[PDB]
């Protein structure tokens, strides 16, 4: 099916403490494959998945200089944006950047992304047309004019439609045995009376890849979203994910309730019962 590549940069200023911390991570789908840490010893782009380790020294040199580059850009940008917003010198602030691409089952380019944040909220973002920008406020409008004059959007689009997609496609082949596999959820159900009258039904899904999954409860065939405690999908720390959905029922009626599991690795959606 469809696949994605994503890079996430995070630069946090620490006034007095020294130089801004810079963290970079790369993902193919729900799989992290690279990493860079300003405070770490190596000062290199590091592998974080096995299939990226077949890339030679030139790759690692290029990625390390590109990611150190970006770190220094955020450095001066941190200063600039502090000035835009008239903020004190003794405050810590956060620039966050995200870009990447989507490809179809045929590996053909679907979408490009480029978005920046200041202090956890939108700053500036590339549009669907890969040509215009969207500024969140007035400070971002100043950045938007600089980027217009420097023709940054053309650079963005050139990357998103080229280097990004073809390296996405490379990774999917080279890491085929890991990236293109679908692990179906291992389901099971639990039960916890809360009183002699009422009891909890919890529907589990474990060991699934990728992260996208859907759990729904149905009393008598009608959907339930009025008791369903859904937890945020979580990593097991072995490349798979977990999720559960709980429902509270009047004791004696639990055979009316069915959990429905929709996942990509499932030929057809599962149904469970207590």
């Amino acid at each position: 099916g469809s696949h994605s590549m994503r890079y996430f940069y995070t630069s946090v200023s620490r006034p007095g403490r020294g130089e801004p911390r810079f963290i970079a991570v790369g993902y193919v789908d729900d799989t992290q494959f690279v990493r860079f840490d300003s405070d770490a010893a190596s000062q290199r782009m590091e592998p974080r998945a096995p299939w990226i380790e077949q890339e030679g020294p030139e790759y690692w040199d290029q990625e390390t200089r590109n990611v150190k580059a970006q770190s220094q850009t955020d450095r001066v940008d941190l200063g600039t944006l502090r000035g835009y917003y008239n903020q004190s010198e003794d405050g810590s602030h956060t620039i966050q950047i995200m870009y990447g691409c989507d490809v179809g089952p045929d590996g053909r380019f679907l979408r490009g992304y480029r978005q920046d944040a200041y202090d956890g909220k939108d700053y500036i973002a590339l549009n669907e047309d890969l040509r215009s920008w969207t500024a969140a406020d007035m400070a971002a409008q100043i950045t938007k004019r600089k980027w217009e004059a420097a023709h940054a959007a053309e650079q963005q689009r050139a990357y998103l439609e080229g280097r990004c997609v073809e390296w996405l496609r490379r990774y999917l082949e080279n890491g085929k045995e890991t990236l293109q596999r679908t692990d179906p959820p291992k389901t099971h159900m639990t039960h916890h009376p809360i009183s002699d009258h009422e009891a909890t039904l919890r529907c589990w899904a474990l060991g699934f890849y990728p992260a996208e999954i859907t759990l729904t409860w149905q009393r008598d065939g009608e959907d339930q979203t009025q008791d369903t405690e859904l937890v945020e999908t979580r990593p097991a720390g072995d490349g798979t994910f977990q999720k559960w959905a709980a429902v509270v029922v009047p004791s004696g009626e639990e055979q009316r309730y069915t959990c429905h599991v929709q996942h990509e690795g499932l030929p057809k959606p599962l149904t469970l019962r207590w």
């Binding site: 590109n66 850009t73 600039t80 420097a150 650079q155």
Partner: peptide, 11 residues
Amino acid sequence: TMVMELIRMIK
């Protein structure tokens, strides 16, 4: 990653 040969992209 972007071959940021630029910073035709400072904010």
